Ligand binder design. Structure first.
Ligand SMILES: Oc1ccc(Br)cc1
Ligand SMILES: Oc1ccc(Br)cc1
Ligand SMILES: Oc1ccc(Br)cc1
Ligand SMILES: Oc1ccc(Br)cc1
Ligand code: SF4
Ligand code: SF4
Ligand code: SF4
Ligand code: SF4
Lengths: 444, 418
C-alpha cells in the first residue's frame, strides 16, 4: 500500500561529521561588495528605454510599464490592469519588514548586534534575563530549546553548524551609524568583519567585531509558496519571495532575543554577514546545486535562508547527502530554462567565473551578472530556475517498501493563483506534516 | 468550509444592544485604569501590575518553577520558559500595540522604510485600478492569509465598538518615557480624505466603511499549560504575529489605492468586530469562540475604505452551550467569570454596559496575573471548544506553533473567500 516522512528521509541520508564543501588553497574570505547587487560592474542596468540606472530602479520602470499595459510579467498579459496592480501591491507589501532588499547592513535597523536598545529589551529589563548568567550550559538541552524557539519564530527548517569563517564576508556593505534611512542607499560603505578576543559582539568606527567565542551558526529555512513560485518570472513569484524576507527578519529578531534572554549573545544577519547557502549545507539543511541554491528534501530550493551566530553551546547537525550532486550532474533543467543563460552546463570547478564568485571552493560556477541583468528586463526577481527544478515539486519522494528514493520520472496562470489554494503564510497543509518536529529530531 | 456555510446567519449584527449603549473609553480597561493598575507583588510592595508580575517571574526562576506552585524540571527549564515568553513580544509595544498612529501602528504608510523604498513605483499614490468589492474581497483575503491570519472576515464598521477615546502618548515622546506619559485622546469620525491625527484628535474618515478581522491561532499544547509560562509564550509570539499582520495588510491595502488603519489591541473592541465579521460567537468567558480554534485564537483588525463584501455572522450554538457549561467560571482562579445569565448591565467600570453579554469582573482577572506571574489563560485552556511543561518542550511543534493535524481546516479557495 506509505506516507511521506522527512525525519526518516533525513536520517537515511545523514552523513558523518565534517564540512562537505571541498576547498583548495586559493580560498579567501569574500568581500560582500562583490555580489552582483552591489558591485559597480553589475549594479547599473538599462531600463526598457535604454537609460542606465541602479538595477532596482530600472526594474521599477518595468513594473510600472507592465501595470499600465495590464501585464503580470514580461509579455504575460494579466486578466486586466487591476489584476496586474494587485500582484505588484502584494509584492511591495511583502517587503514591509526588510531594509533595502535583504537587511544586509550589520548592526543597523532590524539587524542589531545587541538587544540593549530594542523596545522589547527595555520593557523586560526589570526581569534581567539578558543580564543573568545562563542557567543552562548543556549543549544537548540548549539545542532542543533553541530549535523549539526557532519553529515558534517561523522557521520551517532549522539546523546547527560550527561557524566556518570561510563563509563570513571579509567586509560588509553597511552605512555609517549617523546616516538616516532616507540617505542609506546613497551612503553605503564597506566595513571589515573581524574576529577578536572580546566578550560581546561590538562595532567600532573601523570594524565589526565578532568575538572569538562565537562558536556556532543556527540556520533557518523559510518556505516559499509553490503555486506562486511556479509563476516565475511573473509578479506572484516576487510576492512569495518578498513575504519570506519579512518572515526572515522576524525570525532573526525573535531568535536573537530568545538567545539573549537565555544569557548568551546573538548576531542576526538575514542576507548579510555571510554566505547563507554554505552555512545551510554545513548545518545539514540540504545540498548545493547546479543553480547555486541549497536544495532541501522538504522544499527543494524553494525555501529562503537566514542565520544567527551565537556562543550558545549547541550540538552541530550532520550534513546530508540525498544525491543532489549526481542529479544536478545529469539534469541541467535550470541551465536550459534560465532566461539569461547564467547557469553553467559544465562541470564543477574551483575557479570563479567572475568577481561575483568566491574562488577556491568546488561548485557550479554561474554568471550572476547575467542573472541580475534579467531582473530589470522582466521587472521581478525571476526564480525560473527554482520553479523548474524537479526538487521544487511537492511529491518527489517515494518509498519502495525498504527505503526512500527520488522519483526519476520528475527529471525526464496568475488569475488561478489568486482564485486558488492558499493557507496561513502561504504554507500548504498537504505538505505541512513534512516539518512536524519532536525532540528526537531536534537533538540526538 | 462547509461547517461555516452550514451555520451562516442572515445579515445583521448579532450583538443585542439597548438605548443606553455608549462608546467606551479605552482608559477603562483593567490594564490601564487607575483603580486596577497598581497591584502588590509577593513581598507586599505596590507597583504597576506588570512590574509586580515581573517580580514573581524572577522569584519563580530562582526557585525553579514554571508557574505558581509548579516546580520546573530545574532552574534551566524555568529560565527557558520566561526567555521564550519575553522574546515572543519582540514586535509589540508595551503589551498590545494600543497607542494608535505610534511605532508599528502608523495610520499612514508615507514614512515607512518600505514605502520610501518603493516610492518610485507610486503604488500608494496611484488611484485604485479595482473598485469591485467582490474582487477586492478576494484579493485582500488572499493577502491576509499571506500575512499570517489563520482566519479572516469582513464586516461593516460598527462605531459602537470603537473606543470613544484612545490611550496613547504624545507624538514626540521617546519610547523610554512612554509608560510614564500615557494620555487620553478622542477618536472621532469626520468628513476628511485620509485618516489624520491632530494635536487634539484621532480622526477616522467617514468613508471608513469596513473592518477586516484576523484570527491568529495559538498553540494548543502550550496554552494547555496555563497559568504557567508556556501559555505566556504562545500568547506573546502571537502578539508579534498580530503586528506583522497589521503592517503587511495595511501596506497591501495602501498599495492598492486605499487607506488602512492598523490596530492590534487598540482602537476598538476586537471581540465585537470578530463576531460581526463571522469569525465566531461571543462566550461566557467573554472571548470570541471560533469553530476551528475555540477561543484559543488571538484577534487583530484593520479599518479601511476599500470596498468589500461583508461576511455573514455565524451561529453554531455557542450561546446555548455556554448557558449550561460554566466550566471556565468554575476553573477561573480568581472567580472573575460569572455563572449567572447575560445582562445589559456591566459589573464595574471595565465593562461596556448596554450590550447583552456575560458580565465578568475583569479586575479580579488582572489581579491573578501578578500572583501567578503570567497571563493566566485557564479559561481558554479548559473550554471544550478549544480541544507538563517538559513534555511540551520535548514534544510536537511546527512552524509558528501551528499543527499539521488541523492545518487543513484553514485551507482557502476563492469560493470561501467571497
Ligand atoms: O533575494 C532578493 C534580493 C533582492 C531582491 Br529586489 C529580490 C530578491
Ligand atoms: O517605572 C518603571 C516602569 C516600567 C519599567 Br519596564 C521599568 C520601570
Ligand atoms: O493581551 C495581553 C496584554 C498584556 C499582557 Br502583559 C498580556 C496579554
Ligand atoms: O535616487 C534614488 C531615488 C529613489 C530611490 Br528608492 C533611491 C535612490
Ligand atoms: S534544475 Fe536540475 S540541475 Fe538545476 S538545480 Fe535543480 S536538479 Fe540541479
Ligand atoms: S533567477 Fe532567473 S535569470 Fe537568475 S539564474 Fe535563475 S533562471 Fe537564471
Ligand atoms: S484569564 Fe484566568 S483569571 Fe482571567 S478570566 Fe480567564 S481563568 Fe479567570
Ligand atoms: S468553558 Fe464552557 S461556558 Fe466557558 S466559554 Fe467555554 S463553552 Fe462557554
Amino acid at each position: 500500500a506509505k506516507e511521506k516522512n522527512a525525519a526518516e528521509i533525513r536520517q537515511q541520508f545523514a552523513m558523518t561529521a565534517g564540512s562537505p564543501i571541498i576547498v583548495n588553497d586559493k580560498l579567501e574570505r569574500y568581500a560582500e561588495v562583490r555580489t552582483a547587487f552591489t558591485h559597480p560592474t553589475s549594479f547599473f542596468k538599462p531600463n526598457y528605454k535604454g537609460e542606465v540606472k541602479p538595477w532596482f530602479l530600472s526594474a521599477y520602470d518595468e513594473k510600472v510599464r507592465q501595470i499600465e499595459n495590464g501585464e503580470n510579467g514580461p509579455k504575460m498579459k494579466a486578466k486586466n490592469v487591476g489584476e496586474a496592480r494587485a500582484g505588484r501591491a502584494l509584492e511591495a507589501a511583502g517587503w514591509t519588514l526588510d531594509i533595502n532588499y535583504g537587511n544586509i547592513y550589520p548592526n543597523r535597523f532590524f539587524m542589531l548586534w545587541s538587544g540593549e536598545t530594542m523596545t522589547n529589551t527595555q520593557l523586560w529589563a526589570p526581569v534581567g534575563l539578558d543580564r543573568r548568567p545562563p542557567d543552562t550550559t548543556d549543549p544537548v538541552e540548549l539545542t532542543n530549546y533553541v530549535k523549539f524557539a526557532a519553529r515558534m519564530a517561523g522557521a520551517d527548517l532549522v539546523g546547527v553548524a560550527r561557524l566556518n569563517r570561510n563563509w563570513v564576508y571579509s567586509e560588509a556593505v553597511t552605512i555609517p551609524a549617523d546616516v538616516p534611512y532616507e540617505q542609506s542607499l546613497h551612503k553605503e560603505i564597506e566595513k571589515p568583519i573581524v574576529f577578536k578576543d572580546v566578550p560581546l559582539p561590538i562595532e567600532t568606527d573601523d570594524e565589526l567585531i565578532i568575538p572569538n567565542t562565537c562558536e556556532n551558526v543556527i540556520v533557518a529555512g523559510i518556505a516559499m509558496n509553490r503555486e506562486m513560485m511556479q509563476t516565475a518570472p511573473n509578479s506572484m513569484a516576487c510576492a512569495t519571495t518578498a513575504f519570506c524576507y519579512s518572515r526572515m527578519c522576524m525570525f532573526d529578531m525573535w531568535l536573537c532575543q530568545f538567545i539573549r534572554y537565555m544569557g548568551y549573545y546573538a548576531i542576526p544577519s538575514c542576507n548579510g554577514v555571510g554566505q547563507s547557502v554554505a552555512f545551510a549545507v554545513e548545518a545539514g539543511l540540504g545540498q548545493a546545486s547546479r543553480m547555486g541554491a541549497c536544495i532541501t528534501p522538504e522544499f527543494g530550493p524553494n525555501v529562503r535562508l537566514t542565520k544567527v551566530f551565537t556562543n550558545m553551546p549547541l550540538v552541530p547537525d550532520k550534513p546530508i547527502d540525498f544525491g543532489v550532486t549526481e542529479f544536478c550532474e545529469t539534469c541541467k533543467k535550470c541551465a536550459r530554462e534560465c532566461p539569461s543563460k547564467a547557469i553553467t552546463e559544465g562541470p564543477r570547478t574551483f575557479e570563479g567565473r567572475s568577481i561575483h564568485n568566491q574562488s577556491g571552493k568546488l561548485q557550479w560556477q554561474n554568471d550572476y551578472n547575467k542573472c541580475l541583468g534579467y531582473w530589470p528586463e522582466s521587472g521581478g526577481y525571476c526564480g525560473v530556475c527554482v520553479a523548474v527544478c524537479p526538487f521544487t515539486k511537492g511529491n518527489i519522494w517515494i518509498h519502495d517498501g525498504v527505503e526512500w528514493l527520488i522519483d526519476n520520472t520528475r527529471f525526464l496562470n496568475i488569475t488561478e493563483v489568486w482564485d486558488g489554494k492558499i493557507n496561513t503564510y502561504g504554507l500548504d497543509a498537504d505538505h505541512f506534516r513534512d516539518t512536524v518536529s519532536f525532540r528526537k529530531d531536534r537533538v540526538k
